[PDB]
Amino acid sequence: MEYHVAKTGSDEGKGTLKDPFLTINKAASVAMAGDTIIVHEGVYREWVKPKYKGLSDKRRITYKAAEGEKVVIKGSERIQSWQRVEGNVWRCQLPNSFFGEFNPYKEEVFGDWLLTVNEKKHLGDVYLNGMSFYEVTNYEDLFNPQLRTEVLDHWTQKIVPIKNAEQTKYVWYAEVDREKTTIYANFQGADPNEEFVEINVRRSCFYPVETGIDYITVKGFEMAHAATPWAPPTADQPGLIGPNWSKGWIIEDNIIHDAKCSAISIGKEATTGNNYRSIRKDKPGYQYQLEAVFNAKRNGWSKEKIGSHIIRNNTIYDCGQNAIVGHLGGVFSEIYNNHIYNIALKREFYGHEIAGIKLHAAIDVQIHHNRIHDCSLGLWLDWEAQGTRVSKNLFYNNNRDVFVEVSHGPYLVDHNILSSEYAIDNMSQGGAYINNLIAGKMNQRKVLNRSTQYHLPHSTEVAGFAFVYGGDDRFYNNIFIGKEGLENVGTSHYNNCTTSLEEYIEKVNEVPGDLGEFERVEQPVYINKNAYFNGAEPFEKEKDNLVKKDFDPKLAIIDEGDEVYLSLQLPDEFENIVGDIHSTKTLERVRIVDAEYESPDGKELVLDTDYLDAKKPENSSIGPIALLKKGNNYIKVW
Amino acid sequence: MEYHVAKTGSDEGKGTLKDPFLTINKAASVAMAGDTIIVHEGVYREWVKPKYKGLSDKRRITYKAAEGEKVVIKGSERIQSWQRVEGNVWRCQLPNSFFGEFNPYKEEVFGDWLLTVNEKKHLGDVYLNGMSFYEVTNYEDLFNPQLRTEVLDHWTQKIVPIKNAEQTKYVWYAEVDREKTTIYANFQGADPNEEFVEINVRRSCFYPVETGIDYITVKGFEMAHAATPWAPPTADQPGLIGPNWSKGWIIEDNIIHDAKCSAISIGKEATTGNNYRSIRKDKPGYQYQLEAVFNAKRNGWSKEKIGSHIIRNNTIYDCGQNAIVGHLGGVFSEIYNNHIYNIALKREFYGHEIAGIKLHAAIDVQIHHNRIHDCSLGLWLDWEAQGTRVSKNLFYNNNRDVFVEVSHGPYLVDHNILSSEYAIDNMSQGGAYINNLIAGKMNQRKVLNRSTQYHLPHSTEVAGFAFVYGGDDRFYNNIFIGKEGLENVGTSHYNNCTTSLEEYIEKVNEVPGDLGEFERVEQPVYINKNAYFNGAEPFEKEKDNLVKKDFDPKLAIIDEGDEVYLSLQLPDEFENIVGDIHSTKTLERVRIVDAEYESPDGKELVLDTDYLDAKKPENSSIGPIALLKKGNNYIKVW
Amino acid sequence: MEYHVAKTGSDEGKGTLKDPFLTINKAASVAMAGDTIIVHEGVYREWVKPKYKGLSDKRRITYKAAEGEKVVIKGSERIQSWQRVEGNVWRCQLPNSFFGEFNPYKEEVFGDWLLTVNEKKHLGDVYLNGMSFYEVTNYEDLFNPQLRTEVLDHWTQKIVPIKNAEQTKYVWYAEVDREKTTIYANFQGADPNEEFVEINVRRSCFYPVETGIDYITVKGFEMAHAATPWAPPTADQPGLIGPNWSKGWIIEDNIIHDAKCSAISIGKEATTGNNYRSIRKDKPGYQYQLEAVFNAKRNGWSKEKIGSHIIRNNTIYDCGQNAIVGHLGGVFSEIYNNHIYNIALKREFYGHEIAGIKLHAAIDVQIHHNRIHDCSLGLWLDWEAQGTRVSKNLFYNNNRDVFVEVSHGPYLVDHNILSSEYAIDNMSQGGAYINNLIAGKMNQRKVLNRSTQYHLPHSTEVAGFAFVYGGDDRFYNNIFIGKEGLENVGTSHYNNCTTSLEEYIEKVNEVPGDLGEFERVEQPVYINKNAYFNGAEPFEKEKDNLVKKDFDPKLAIIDEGDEVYLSLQLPDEFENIVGDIHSTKTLERVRIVDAEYESPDGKELVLDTDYLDAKKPENSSIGPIALLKKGNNYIKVW
């Protein structure tokens, strides 16, 4: 059945093209496997709750915007009952019943790993012609807000410009008592009843209220203004849109923005753990997170039931926690061709769950061909990045590009452009960085007081757990570019590491013993055929490399809106380093997990296509794009 | 069917009382669920391999000695083909075919955690009228062997007397080439052909060659001389007798001795891990042990399939590694009324798997009413001692009594007599020490570089894993007794600890954060109503105790063979410290595992019966025996 | 923390004794493990939703009525806005918001195995001074309703008296439109605004809205009027009160009544299956139920996570489907000392899920010491009654007492009084009926077209599945009593069965083959020491029995309200038939499941205590009560 939803419809209608339903949730309450719901032009202010599940990729339930029509799903409501209080501050009041069980003005940003606990923030928001406001703590703070032009990036502790400085003068404050919700905001001279002013109302826009609602496709919508809660790996992780612990969704061709915390969630649900560290306070979130993995396994977390979602061709921006988030629920998924930007720039709250894309237990997840910029952190893989492949992505203008935390691999980062000044936080082992352009520092550190799970290959089955001893990383064919005032760019980090698993084994076994003898030897690294320019420094034992400290590539990423260009100068010697095509055969297995770098289907993996998807020759130049050459390079990269 | 085996029988017979079989293995080849095998007087030199399984506790297969008859199963053979070489050294030679696939003279003591790797030892042995020999390395060492009267205890590094000094002059040496096995031994003047001289030949005496041969009862036999291999938790763990990965065996009323390494094994089998650290050398046994736990879980390691064995009323002695050993295969078992002694005293080899009783993953195992003495270590619970209860046992004359390593509990040690000078090695957390007599030091240490699993209660399901932060131990109603020249007796080890989970939580939560804030605070301890004499020192914050540093109890354990007495003096003030009856209600839950102390069936546990099984009132003497009182005390304890 | 709720309280208060909350759900939203919620006198019209879970039996969350106070939780609301329409029919109108998401007047009795599909019924109800009404189909049916004094019992197809005939004249009919709900009812002359008139409004009274809220105790309340939905094993199974897929609840000392369908549910939740046969219509519920078992196993259905609930000392009555219901969620539970009556007597709807107590997969469930009467079916065990023990219960005045369907056992029915004319529906195998008094017929039938799961003992692990071939039943020490006209009372049903597993094996193996050879031989029965009076007939091969067809015991159950008595005459020959004490040793294992009859803890079971809990000697009267003897007997049985 093909159901139609249109603003000329009625929920008492049949739902056909001639007699369409009026609300999307009406269609969502009757559609069954194999049906399609076509939504016509309009703004739908509702939270769509798919009731029945698709049954296979062929028998999906597909929700899509009518061809060529603009369809918007919003969690907000326009408010035109404001009254001027004094100056540029106005007030509106609503019955608590307006919000039902979930009131964003009462609900706090709360939970494990939220670090800004002194200044409470709520899930509400106010918008003036689409522009969100900054919450203030006290009523008095509304009247003379101060324009701010720079802000401290929490992780890097660097003061950086505020992209939209004017926005800092637009503030809101609210109170909720037993009967009413009262919201105040400074509109800086505008009349909020005349302009288009909206406030957050609902938690989500498109999200099932039962788990297991598999095989849903959502395509072609603009979705916005969702009062989503702080979403750590140890709690339920609702988003503006998400599968809610199920399998086989396809979220594509959507424009998603203004989610309070996370926009798209492929995370977990509450029964396997819900902020126990913050609520019970007896054990840390570290301890509760490793327990949640086993709780989920007992609840059937496996390839057969969870994951394998596809998030593609979406534009996601202006979210406070993440464009994409999720612990466990994203295993085996694919995330590609997305444009993600402006994630967590307002910094109204901060904690260890913020990033353009953040995934815990991203088992065999493929993240490729994404454009990620203007984020405080572009990508964060945190725990169980086993089989994960981050390939052909464009990262620029971020405070940090990539962070792989407490993972054991085998994980692959290949053919990417990591152009920000702080490129990589590496608190893992078992990685392979192949054919990337890396123009920022790498902070590499062991993690000896946190042990985390590893798995059997291509599975959620747990094989063991380990601390991060550091090293056991591969680096081949990368172009590293340092910068005056920037330290730790390159691979010198591994200077005390062994150079093969054979060497590591021989050294460990010189003196009889067990764990202590292994701990006294540094793990092996496999590093060759990299170039180091402008101050980047190499692993001292690297056999074949190109080091030109006085050569300045003058790298620039030029963002012209829809198109992006890479400008780079390379030395004549660039052409002298010939990279090999890497594959399962060329990449040494990781030590602890004892697994190879392969495709998700268990077959041999060959890294023979570059950033531009060009087939790579056996004898190629290094870096992410085969066509780079000595001299000037001006390449369209998006 | 009731089958009979007798030395007047024939394996071609029917196996009836009037027409019995000749070998026990013949009966083992035909008995089925519900059958009984009655063995008549004689020495049966064979390895019995139960072929079919029992099907329930009611439909077991029972192997037993005929009432009032002496039945012996031996893995050795008597040798009467010795030829004098020179002096007191004699030689015999056997075809390699005599040993089949397993030749003790070629097989080495080998494997993970074996520490004495410079001096190779083998699994063979030579006996003169029942007394085993000491192996020597070179042919030359045979002729003028040196009498030794003292030996260094490896763990304590203390020089101690050799119990049987004369035995140190009886040595053997062997060679195995492509065709023959040649054995030499110094008989110190005796004629080995006239005397009764035996050599090890077979690996085991009563052990299935397939796994899953459940519900077998083995009763009333003497079994001896088994060339058993080194049995770490990361390898196959065969023993002289054992269930070989199955459920519901009852091993009772047997006299077992002279197993090279371990006597009774309720351990694991090879498919879940087999000395990978020693063979592959890429990861430590630590890493391979935690993996074996998950490997076993996939192989069905659960209450439904493995464990629940009973080992009771046996006498086990003169073994080189353990009287009872086992990783995983012993879950939910009961070990009681056994007399275990002389374990690992020869010290021909040493490593971290030696103890009278050693169990890894002793989940809900009950070890009670056992007499354990003259061992280098009486009991070692290593990993996953969750729900384990060590109750009413008698430990004396051991270099060390108990070791609980890298466990999280809740584990209970109650109403025991730990009378050796080094009583406890505590490298765990989550313990409850209740109503014990402790007369030796405790070495308590954190283990921050090894994390180990914990489980859901009364189950093999894994709930998480953790390192050992130290503390979170309870000590109530114990009588501690120090000694001059002995440090660390008592509970002063915990002076820096918090005193309640509420205090710990309050301190940890003083400043926002996660794991780091928890690690900065010491775990709570629950200590009260203990007495400290002759040098023992108390936890400084203990509220109610009795400390008389100068009072000497003059503790003595008098072993008269079949009977054992306890002699002890107590001060008049002893009448003034009264112990409470502890129970699930009175014992605070352990922090990390978040579980209570209770019975294996999930019911509340009340510790109201003492070492002598006397029911005691709410107000009673502290210590293991309610009869103890001020003044002189002379109690039969065995 | 001990929270207090009272009608003089405030949900803005601290929740203390002096400053108590006003609503129970307020306390339910803040209580945490270890806390107690004490509710003071009053009628609380709300659905209590426990938010946090208890963590162990010691750390439960307890909700209880203040001592000696009458506390009622109702799902209804009193209506005093009625307007007379004509004659004795009145009408009230409520905006749909009064009901919110769940409107009983819109919701139908619907789902798998509902058989009365031509006459639609809804979940609403109207009460006049506590007496519920009968729904009618059309507006016109309200005006001159007909008094009915008899009704057809659907299963037995017997016309029986309607207990409360006057109630049949009180009818209601409702109309729900886009804005409001209009309810009409005939009050037969009373003024509904002056009398106490209530209507159903909420679905449940005390039931979590998240699964996994373990270890809750609910005690001392009266709870009533819940619009609960039809609850088959293939759908979500909400009730008036229930644990909603969790472990360790204790529901005790409550008076529960007027649940539309099921009152106490220890059933399953939606994700494992939700009326797929009725909604998708591609496969039968039979097929979807066996799938739900595997779906639940994947979701953690096991003793570690689900079940082990205790339902005791409650009075439950006037429900349309069951007093207690549940598929899967009740494993390992205990149901005792409950008084259940008046279940499904109005017969407004009928289907295959109706019974006083109905449980699917009642693994190791103990149902004992309950009084069940005036039900259309007293107890229905349906699939996987493995380890179930129905002991010492009192059944009378039921159209049918017990139904054990498509189960393989071993299940035990001992020491019960089954006094209704149709005592047993036996569509299973593997049962043991020991020491019962059975005064009605047994309908025993094979089920060759439905195969159902069996398990490993004391576990939810699946071992296999089988059809019901019939037989493999044990009958020992029962007193059977026929009645003029009543057919099939006794054990003659099994006349062509074999008498031992040895005989069965011998006959099947006469000619080579597989399944077909087994299907042609009747399974064995183990029947001895039973008495047959007043027309009951014995198995023709029973060795020792007492048959007196012309003796009439004149059995009567005398219900005096709070006490119930059994009157029975027995012949002098009753003294000469002596019953044996049955136990795990005496009861032959069941054939297909290959398991013994034992206690849930795996220990031997000994059936040496009678209905009155008297320990009996080796030689005792047969039947359920050792006090019964030749002559007149008048015994208190409740």
- Residue among C56, C302, C596, C603 with most chain B CBs within 10 A, to mutate: C56
Contacts of A270 in chain C (CB under 8 A): 210
**3-state DSSP percent of chain C in helix, strand and coil, to 5:** 10, 35, 55
* Contact status, residue C73 vs residue C205, Cβ threshold 8 Å: yes
The answer on C137 and C241 residing in a single domain is no
CA atoms within 13 A on the CB side of A518: 21
Is B306:B331 a contact under the CB 8 Å cutoff? Answer: yes
- With an 8 Å Cβ cutoff, are B277 and A112 in contact? no
Strand ranges in A203-319 using DSSP code E only, listed in sequence order = 216-219, 222-226, 250-252, 255-259, 262-265, 310-312, 315-319
Phi and psi for B73 in degrees, rounded to 5? -115, 125
**Which residue, A185, A202, A219, sits at the end of a domain?**
A202
The residue among A434, A455, A424, A428 whose CA lies nearest residue A624 is A434
Per DSSP bridges, beta strands A479-481 and A531-533 are: parallel
Chain B interface includes C502 (CB < 8 A):
no
The burial class, CB within 10 Å (0-12 / 13-18 / 19+), for A5 is: buried
One domain for residues B196 and B216: no
C-alpha–C-alpha distance, residues B543 and A406, integer Å = 43
Total domain count, chain C: 2
Q: What are the chain C neighbours of A305 within 8 Å (beta carbons)? A: 298
**CB-CB neighbors (< 8 A) of A591 in chain B:** 282-283
CA dist., res. C95 & res. C76, Å (int): 16
Contact yes or no for C58 and B461 at CB 8 A: no
Asked if residue A377 lies in contact with residue A347, where contact means CB atoms within 8 angstroms, the answer is no
Interface test with C, best of B32, B57, B297, B591 (most C CBs within 10 A): B57
Same domain, B135 and B218: no
- CB–CB of B304 and C585 under 8 A? no
Q: Which chains touch B (3 or more CB pairs under 8 A)?
A: A, C
Q: Give the end of a domain, one of B202, B217, B245.
A: B202
* Cβ contact A270–C12 (<8 Å): no
Chain B positions in Cβ-Cβ contact with residue A588 (cut-off 8 Å): none
Q: Which of A109, A498, A515 to mutate to test the interface with B (most CBs of B within 10 A)?
A: A515
Q: What is the DSSP letter of C8?
A: T
Cβ atoms of C391 and C416 closer than 8 Å: yes
Q: Enumerate the H helices of A60-190 as residue ranges.
A: none
Taking contacts as CB-CB distances below 8 angstroms, the residues of chain B near A519 are: 449
Q: Inter-chain contact B117–A277, Cβ cutoff 8 Å?
A: no
**What CA–CA distance (Å, rounded) separates B582 from B605?**
9
CA distance A509 to A517: 7
Sign of the dihedral through C-alpha B513, B514, B519, B525: positive
User: By the CB < 8 Å criterion, does B577 face chain A?
Assistant: no
Kindly state whether B584 is in contact with chain C, defined as any CB-CB distance less than 8 angstroms. yes
Asked if the Cβ–Cβ distance from A501 to B287 is below 8 Å, we say no
The residue type of A159 is I
Residue finishing a domain among B175, B202, B229 = B202
Nearest C-alpha in C relative to A245? C271
Question: In degrees, to the nearest 5, what angle opens at C-alpha C471 toward C-alphas C465 and C477?
Answer: 125
Please, which residues bridge with residue B65 across strands? B39
- Shared domain for B326 and B368, answered yes or no, is yes
Are A141 and A69 in the same domain?
no
Judging contacts by C-beta atoms under 8 Å, the chain C residues touching residue A280 are 32
> Which residue in B283, B512, B594 is closest to A117 by CB distance?
B512
**Do residues C158 and C226 both lie within one domain?**
no
Distance, in angstroms, between B94 CA and closest chain C CA?
Answer: 49
Two structure tokens written together for B602: 């999930």
Kindly state whether A517 is in contact with chain B, defined as any CB-CB distance less than 8 angstroms.
Answer: yes
- Tell whether B113 lies on the interface with A, counting CB pairs under 8 A: yes
Residues C396 and C251 grouped into a single domain: yes
Two tokens at B610?
Answer: 């003492």
Q: Report whether C284 contacts C233 (CB < 8 A).
A: no
Instruction: Classify residue B446 by burial, with Cβ atoms within 10 Å: 0-12, 13-18, 19+.
Output: middle
Cβ-defined contact of A283 to B462 (cutoff 8 Å): no
**Separation between Cα atoms, residue A207 and residue C176, nearest integer Å:** 29
C135 and C230 together in one domain: no
- The conformation of residue C463, written as its DSSP 8-state character, comes to E
From the list B56, B305, B585, which residue is nearest C596 (CB)? Answer: B56
Q: Which residues of A touch B463 (CB under 8 A)?
A: 291, 294
Of A271, A279, A305, nearest to C211 by CB-CB distance is A271
> With a CB-CB cutoff of 8 Å, which residues 279-318 of chain A face chain C?
279-280, 298-300, 302, 304-305
- Name which of A396, A406, A107, A96 is nearest A233 in CA terms: A406
Considering the domain architecture, whether residues A250 and A194 belong to the same structural domain is answered as no
Q: Report the CATH number at residue B165.
A: 2.60.40.1180
| HEC sequence for A299-331 | CCCCCCCCECCEEECCEEEEECCEEEEEECCCC
What backbone torsions phi and psi does residue C271 show, to the nearest 5 degrees? -65, -25
Which residues on neighbouring strands pair with residue B371, listed in sequence order?
B339, B394
Method: X-ray
Task: Check CB contact of C457 with chain B, cutoff 8 Å.
Answer: yes
Distances C18 to B384, C14, C21, C41 between C-alpha atoms, Å: 47, 9, 10, 15
With CB atoms and an 8 Å threshold, state whether A210 touches C178. no
Nearest C-alpha of chain A: how many angstroms from B153?
A: 19
Residue A465 to residue B449, Cβ atoms within 8 A: no
Does B585 reach chain C within 8 Å, measured CB to CB?
Answer: yes
* Residues B359 and B421 occupy one common structural domain: yes
- Verify whether the Cβ–Cβ distance B465 to A463 is below 8 Å: no
Residue numbers of the domain that contains A321: 1-74+203-638
Q: Rounded to an integer, what distance in angstroms lies between the CA atom of residue C155 and that of residue A540?
A: 87
- The phi-psi region of residue B622 (left if phi > 0; otherwise alpha if psi is between -120 and 50; otherwise beta) is beta
The CATH code of the domain that includes A4 is 2.160.20.10
CB-based contact C595 B58, cutoff 8 Å: no
The reply to whether C506 touches chain A by the CB within 8 Å rule is: no
SS (H, E, C) A157-197: CEEEECCCCHHHHCEEEEEECCCEEEEEEECCCCCCCCCCE
Q: Does A83 touch chain C (CB under 8 A)?
A: no
Q: Which amino acid is at B75?
A: G
Residues with Cβ within 8 Å of B108's Cβ and at least 6 positions away in sequence, in order, are B120, B121, B122, B123
Distance from CA of C381 to the nearest CA of A (A): 27
Nearest Cα residue to B304 out of C302, C365, C389, C588: C302
- Helix (H) or strand (E) holding C29, with range, is helix C24-30
DSSP B232-291: -TTS----SB--SS-B--EEES-EEEEESSEEEE----GGG--SHHHHH-SS-HHHHHHH
Phi, psi of C216 (to 5 degrees): -110, 135
Q: Show residues of chain A in contact with B112, CB under 8 Å.
A: 514
Nearest to B407 by CA among B350, B352, B363: B363
Q: Say whether B318 sits in a helix, a strand or coil.
A: strand
Q: Does A12 touch chain C (CB under 8 A)?
A: yes
Q: Does B449 touch chain A (CB under 8 A)?
A: yes
Do residue C283 and residue C182 come from a single domain?
no
Distances (CA, A) of B251 to A561, B178, B261, B280: 79, 39, 18, 36
In order of A238, A284, A291, C30, the CA distances from A232 in angstroms are 10, 13, 14, 22
β-strands B89-95, B83-86 pairing: antiparallel
* Contact list, B304 vs chain C (CB under 8 Å): 456-459, 461
Interface test with B, best of A288, A518, A523, A589 (most B CBs within 10 A): A518
Contacts of C280 in chain A (CB under 8 A): 32
Instruction: Give CA–CA dist C424/C401, Å, rounded.
Output: 6
Q: CB distance from A591 to chain B under 8 Å?
A: yes
Sorted by sequence, the CB contacts under 8 Å of residue A611 that are 6+ apart come out as: A392, A415, A416, A417, A624, A625, A637
SS3 at position B486: coil
- Measured in angstroms, the CA of A407 and the nearest CA of chain B are apart by 16
Statement to judge: residues A93 and A45 lie in one domain: no
CA distance linking residue B484 with residue A221, whole number of Å: 82
C485: which residues sit within 8 A by CB, 6+ positions away? Answer: none
DSSP codes joined into one string, B528-543: ES-EEETT-B--TT-S
